[PDB]
Design an enzyme around this catalytic site. Sequence first.
Site, PDB file in Angstrom:
ATOM      1  N   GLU A   1       0.963  -1.431  -0.120  1.00  0.00           N
ATOM      2  CA  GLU A   1       0.070   0.434  -0.283  1.00  0.00           C
ATOM      3  C   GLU A   1       0.650   1.759   0.653  1.00  0.00           C
ATOM      4  OE1 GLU A   1      -3.424   0.538  -0.777  1.00  0.00           O
ATOM      5  OE2 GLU A   1      -4.052  -1.310   0.131  1.00  0.00           O
ATOM      6  N   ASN A  50      -6.767   9.401  -6.197  1.00  0.00           N
ATOM      7  CA  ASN A  50      -7.992   8.758  -6.431  1.00  0.00           C
ATOM      8  C   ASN A  50      -9.141  10.390  -7.374  1.00  0.00           C
ATOM      9  OD1 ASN A  50      -7.634   7.922  -3.559  1.00  0.00           O
ATOM     10  ND2 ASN A  50      -6.736   5.996  -4.676  1.00  0.00           N
ATOM     11  N   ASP A  74     -12.344  10.187  -7.566  1.00  0.00           N
ATOM     12  CA  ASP A  74     -13.025  10.514  -6.999  1.00  0.00           C
ATOM     13  C   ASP A  74     -12.438  11.451  -6.028  1.00  0.00           C
ATOM     14  OD1 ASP A  74     -12.572   9.357  -4.778  1.00  0.00           O
ATOM     15  OD2 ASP A  74     -13.886   7.891  -3.640  1.00  0.00           O
ATOM     16  N   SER A 103     -10.629  11.740  -3.864  1.00  0.00           N
ATOM     17  CA  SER A 103     -10.632  11.135  -1.970  1.00  0.00           C
ATOM     18  C   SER A 103      -8.545  10.968  -2.349  1.00  0.00           C
ATOM     19  CB  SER A 103     -11.123  10.531  -1.676  1.00  0.00           C
ATOM     20  OG  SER A 103     -11.225   9.175  -2.195  1.00  0.00           O
ATOM     21  N   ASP A 119      -5.252   8.821  -0.194  1.00  0.00           N
ATOM     22  CA  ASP A 119      -5.624   7.817   0.416  1.00  0.00           C
ATOM     23  C   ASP A 119      -3.717   8.337   1.549  1.00  0.00           C
ATOM     24  OD1 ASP A 119      -7.613   5.842  -0.253  1.00  0.00           O
ATOM     25  OD2 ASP A 119      -6.511   5.180  -1.894  1.00  0.00           O
ATOM     26  N   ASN A 163      -8.332   6.405   3.588  1.00  0.00           N
ATOM     27  CA  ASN A 163      -8.935   7.162   2.738  1.00  0.00           C
ATOM     28  C   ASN A 163      -9.854   8.419   3.360  1.00  0.00           C
ATOM     29  OD1 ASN A 163     -11.904   7.369   0.858  1.00  0.00           O
ATOM     30  ND2 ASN A 163     -10.326   7.127  -0.558  1.00  0.00           N
TER      31      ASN A 163
HETATM   32  O1  LIG Z   1     -14.541   2.074   2.904  1.00  0.00           O
HETATM   33  C1  LIG Z   1     -13.526   1.870   2.613  1.00  0.00           C
HETATM   34  C2  LIG Z   1     -13.477   1.102   0.970  1.00  0.00           C
HETATM   35  O2  LIG Z   1     -13.223   2.002  -0.076  1.00  0.00           O
HETATM   36  C3  LIG Z   1     -12.682   1.228  -1.122  1.00  0.00           C
HETATM   37  C4  LIG Z   1     -12.933   1.613  -2.598  1.00  0.00           C
HETATM   38  O3  LIG Z   1     -13.942   1.298  -3.029  1.00  0.00           O
HETATM   39  O4  LIG Z   1     -11.234   1.689  -0.773  1.00  0.00           O
HETATM   40  C5  LIG Z   1     -10.347   3.137  -0.085  1.00  0.00           C
HETATM   41  O5  LIG Z   1     -10.005   2.803   1.359  1.00  0.00           O
HETATM   42  C6  LIG Z   1      -9.006   1.859   1.230  1.00  0.00           C
HETATM   43  C7  LIG Z   1      -9.229   2.018   2.608  1.00  0.00           C
HETATM   44  O6  LIG Z   1      -8.624   3.457   3.368  1.00  0.00           O
HETATM   45  C8  LIG Z   1      -7.398   2.492   0.456  1.00  0.00           C
HETATM   46  O7  LIG Z   1      -6.442   1.128   0.943  1.00  0.00           O
HETATM   47  C9  LIG Z   1      -8.575   2.529  -1.457  1.00  0.00           C
HETATM   48  O8  LIG Z   1      -6.919   2.552  -1.810  1.00  0.00           O
HETATM   49  C10 LIG Z   1      -9.789   3.139  -1.647  1.00  0.00           C
HETATM   50  O9  LIG Z   1      -9.847   3.181  -2.431  1.00  0.00           O
HETATM   51  C11 LIG Z   1     -12.852  -0.010  -0.801  1.00  0.00           C
HETATM   52  O10 LIG Z   1     -11.892  -1.172  -1.005  1.00  0.00           O
HETATM   53  C12 LIG Z   1     -13.030   0.000   0.966  1.00  0.00           C
HETATM   54  O11 LIG Z   1     -14.079  -0.757   1.171  1.00  0.00           O
END
Ligand SMILES: OC[C@H]1O[C@@](CO)(O[C@H]2O[C@H](CO)[C@@H](O)[C@H](O)[C@H]2O)[C@@H](O)[C@@H]1O
Length: 129
Positions: free
Chosen positions: A35, A46, A48, A50, A52, A59
């Site tokens: 990661e 990302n 959208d 947001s 990380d 996120n």
């Molecule tokens: O609850 C977070 C949810 O969002 C997703 C994308 O739909 O992942 C995001 O959050 C993660 C944890 O913080 C990041 O590692 C990832 O890169 C980010 O896209 C789902 O995977 C996750 O269930």
Amino acid sequence: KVFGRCELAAAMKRHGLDNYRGYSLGNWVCAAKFESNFNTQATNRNTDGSTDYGILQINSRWWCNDGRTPGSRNLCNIPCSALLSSDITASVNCAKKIVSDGNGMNAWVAWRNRCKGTDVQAWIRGCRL
Ligand SMILES: OC[C@H]1O[C@@](CO)(O[C@H]2O[C@H](CO)[C@@H](O)[C@H](O)[C@H]2O)[C@@H](O)[C@@H]1O
């Protein structure tokens, strides 16, 4: 701070991540490796809007507040910047809530694609825990 493999394993173990919700330590170290490459200062935006943050790439849409992700939640009630510290406490406590959310470690894309189903124990081999 860029952690060493064993150094991070020891830090996570002390913070109670080993076997947390049934996930052995190797899983958490493997997730951190892919990661953020063990770098507490890693950030990635990302599509959208947001971002990380930190060693476990938490996120901003759901877990922390960075002041620039509109309509987002702050489930871990912490500024995202807190997740970039050399002290992993904040990241660990937040990760504990994320993994208890329902989908487990599948929340971490890299874990799902590069750690899940592999010999994660290899990530802590040779370490003095
Ligand atoms: O609850 C977070 C949810 O969002 C997703 C994308 O739909 O992942 C995001 O959050 C993660 C944890 O913080 C990041 O590692 C990832 O890169 C980010 O896209 C789902 O995977 C996750 O269930």
